[PDB]
Amino acid sequence: TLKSRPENLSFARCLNTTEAKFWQTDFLKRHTFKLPLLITDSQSCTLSTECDTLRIDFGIKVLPVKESMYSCSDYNYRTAIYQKIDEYIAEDGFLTLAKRYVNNIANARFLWRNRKGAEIIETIVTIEDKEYPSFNSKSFNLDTFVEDNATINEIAQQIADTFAGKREYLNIYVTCFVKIGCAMEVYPSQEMTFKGKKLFKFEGSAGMHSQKINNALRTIDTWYPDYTTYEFPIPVENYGAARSIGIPFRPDTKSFYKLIDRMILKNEDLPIEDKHYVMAILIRGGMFSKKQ
């Protein structure tokens, strides 16, 4: 008996990312030594003459999906959403999407531009008081998604269960070690002071906005119409709109709006790829409403 989406429907994000803060260190004494890394006034940022490593620290909080609806002005549609998410938790325990997220952590895509010309990159992931074995970060590629590593599975199981109910929260902390070399530029983020390139400062030091680190970890969509022609992962957006190649990659029937209209407002079993895209859009969040 459902004819349309409600006049107010919104979700919240189930993957919360903190802002990054930049540090400098040496490499053979990296586990005993840290120094501030500051902006030099156009603005610029460069390492010192005695350090050869940039350390980037940030953390992630994972929340359940079912208890992440902020507004729904029709109880029936809420009952429909809760039953559909329970159906997906029966088939797949949110393992594919979470495996892809931990893979995007391990490939070190969160070091945009800061990654070209590095010599050794390592990334350690800590959950609770137990450190996990580090990642080589250059034995991975930005086109493929590994599914047979041990630690990636062992983290993605924890993230999964919590996207699905069995745990209420998960706090994940990640540290990185990029060896670009002495007296080389840093490339932190940039502010729309809205002249000159005003760089971002976080607690005196430099860092990236949390939105850029989030948009690096949501490039997991390899289930779009024209993927055989252009073979590259895109960010998980609504009317899929990767800004580099300035052409909408999903303008039409496979859009989130149509696809969720053809799953709640008229029962129809989508393929598993389309479910894997919709349950993601829900992990991101937005004002998915209507103009009734």
- Least separation in angstroms between residue 223's CB and other proteins is 15
**Phi, then psi, of 163 in degrees rounded to 5:** -80, -10
Q: Determine, following the binding rule CB under 8 A, whether residue 242 of this chain makes contact with other proteins.
A: yes
Question: In this chain, which of 37, 60, 213, 234 binds other proteins, going by CB under 8 A?
Answer: 234
Kindly identify the residues of this chain, within the stretch 71-100, that bind other proteins according to CB under 8 A.
none
Q: Determine, following the binding rule CB under 8 A, whether residue 228 of this chain makes contact with other proteins.
A: no
One-letter identity of residue 75: Y
What three-state secondary structure class fits 261? helix
> Are 54 and 188 a contacting pair, CB within 8 Å?
no
x-or-dash string of contact with other proteins, 108-137, rule CB under 8 A: -x--xx-xx---------------------
- Least separation in angstroms between residue 116's CB and other proteins is 6
Q: Determine, following the binding rule CB under 8 A, whether residue 250 of this chain makes contact with other proteins.
A: no
| Nearest in space to 174 (alpha carbons), one of 125, 227, 219, 222 | 125
Which two structure tokens, joined as six digits, stand for 104? Answer: 């995007």
**230 versus 257: smaller Cβ distance to other proteins:** 230
Question: In this chain, which of 27, 33, 70, 230 binds other proteins, going by CB under 8 A?
Answer: 230
Question: What is d(CA 88, CA 86) in angstroms, rounded to the nearest whole number?
Answer: 5
Q: Determine, following the binding rule CB under 8 A, whether residue 245 of this chain makes contact with other proteins.
A: yes
Length of the chain: 292
One-letter identity of residue 160: A
Q: Determine, following the binding rule CB under 8 A, whether residue 183 of this chain makes contact with other proteins.
A: no
Exposure class string for 111-136: b at 16+ Cβ within 10 A, else e:
beebbeebeebbbebebeeeebeebe
- Least separation in angstroms between residue 137's CB and other proteins is 12
Binding site for other proteins (CB under 8 A): 109, 112-113, 115-116, 141-143, 216, 219, 230, 232-234, 242, 244-245
